[PDB]
Design a protein around this ligand. Structure first.
Ligand SMILES: NC(=O)c1ccc[n+]([C@@H]2O[C@H](COP(=O)([O-])OP(=O)(O)OC[C@H]3O[C@@H](n4cnc5c(N)ncnc54)[C@H](OP(=O)(O)O)[C@@H]3O)[C@@H](O)[C@H]2O)c1
Length: 316
């Protein structure tokens, strides 16, 4: 297991990164500092997480400390849905750059294919509680992303939560200048994603797996929901290999040629989670983990199920 995967922009991306969704602002600076100290070189961020300033304090401090060089870090952020308009993309990217203490991002993603009405509210509502769409489509937002590459603000651009028909729409865009480098999607043993992965990889698009542990701290968790970290079938594979269940859940996507971004703010788990380059799951282990699929999503964007570009009506 090599630590980096080659993207279709010619740059290399670390296959393990640290997630930051739900990381409290008073904990995430120390989480990112610890992560860099114990070997992480990739941090997954987003403006909608409301903690980029605090992530940036950690990055800046480790660059100033000369723990790492900027060229050795791979920092990812995402354009939120209320900024899909031509005239707002650059300022959204630049706010993220300012917050993160950076002069460029390694990768900038369209967070979801759905554009929303611009304004202060991240989920603007009509009176009856529906999210209010933007009329701007994925293709014009993609052209705005391409301009960020050509202005030096981002090294790579990509997409997130795009279904295969939406990836195809990008790839078939008239006058396409840069292909997406990455599609970041939910992926774990309960949502194994073979078709969408198979499609993206066949096109040279690297897939990043989010919520690889099943997001036990997701805000809408219900007790009756399945639990990867407690699944005795997965705990058995981990015991066989003398690893934790989380380490198996992180190694799994790595052996599918995916990038994976487990989140923690607990120092011991941050270190735990990185110690996944010294063991191999067998093919039988991999097939067995894949067999647990049940099409279960942490992130189903339920307020947006009538948006024209809602991604999860399509089989994949
Ligand atoms: N593109 C998108 O739309 C999108 C959507 C969802 C997620 N993401 C990205 O993917 C990242 C990861 O997904 P996620 O945050 O949903 O969830 P996750 O990484 O699947 O799970 C995070 C949870 O697992 C716990 N945990 C971490 N390591 C553990 C270990 N070794 N043992 C036991 N528990 C452990 C964490 O607790 P503590 O933190 O308390 O240690 C936290 O409660 C996000 O943070 C975000 O960066 C992107």
């Amino acid at each position: 297991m090599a630590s980096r995967i080659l993207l279709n922009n010619g740059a290399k991306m670390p296959i393990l990164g640290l997630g930051t969704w739900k990381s409290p602002p008073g904990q995430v600076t120390e989480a990112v500092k610890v992560a860099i100290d114990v070997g992480y070189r990739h941090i997954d961020c987003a403006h909608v997480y409301q903690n980029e300033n605090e992530v940036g304090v950690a990055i800046q401090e480790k660059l100033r400390e000369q723990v790492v060089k900027r060229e050795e870090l791979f920092i990812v952020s995402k354009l939120w849905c209320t900024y899909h308009e031509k005239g707002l993309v650059k300022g959204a990217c630049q706010k993220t750059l300012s917050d993160l203490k950076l002069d460029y991002l390694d990768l900038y993603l369209i967070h979801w294919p759905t554009g929303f009405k611009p304004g202060k509210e991240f989920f603007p509502l009509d009176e009856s509680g529906n999210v209010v769409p933007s009329d701007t489509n994925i293709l014009d937002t993609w052209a705005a992303m391409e301009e960020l590459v050509d202005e030096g603000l981002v090294k790579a651009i990509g997409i997130s939560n795009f279904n295969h028909l939406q990836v195809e729409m990008i790839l078939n865009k008239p006058g396409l200048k840069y292909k997406p480098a990455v599609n970041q999607i939910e992926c774990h043993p309960y949502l194994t994603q073979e078709k969408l992965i198979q499609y993206c990889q066949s096109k040279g698009i690297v897939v990043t797996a989010y919520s690889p542990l099943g997001s036990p701290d997701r805000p809408w968790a219900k007790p009756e929901d399945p639990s990867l970290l407690e699944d005795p079938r997965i705990k058995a594979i981990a015991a066989k290999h003398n690893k934790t269940t989380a380490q198996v859940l992180i190694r799994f996507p790595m052996q599918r040629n995916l990038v994976v971004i487990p989140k923690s703010v607990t120092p011991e788990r941050i270190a735990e989670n990185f110690k996944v380059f010294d063991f191999e799951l067998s093919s039988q282990d991999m097939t067995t983990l894949l067999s647990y699929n049940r099409n279960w999503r942490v992130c189903a964007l339920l307020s947006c199920t009538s948006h024209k570009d809602y991604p999860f009506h399509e089989e994949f």
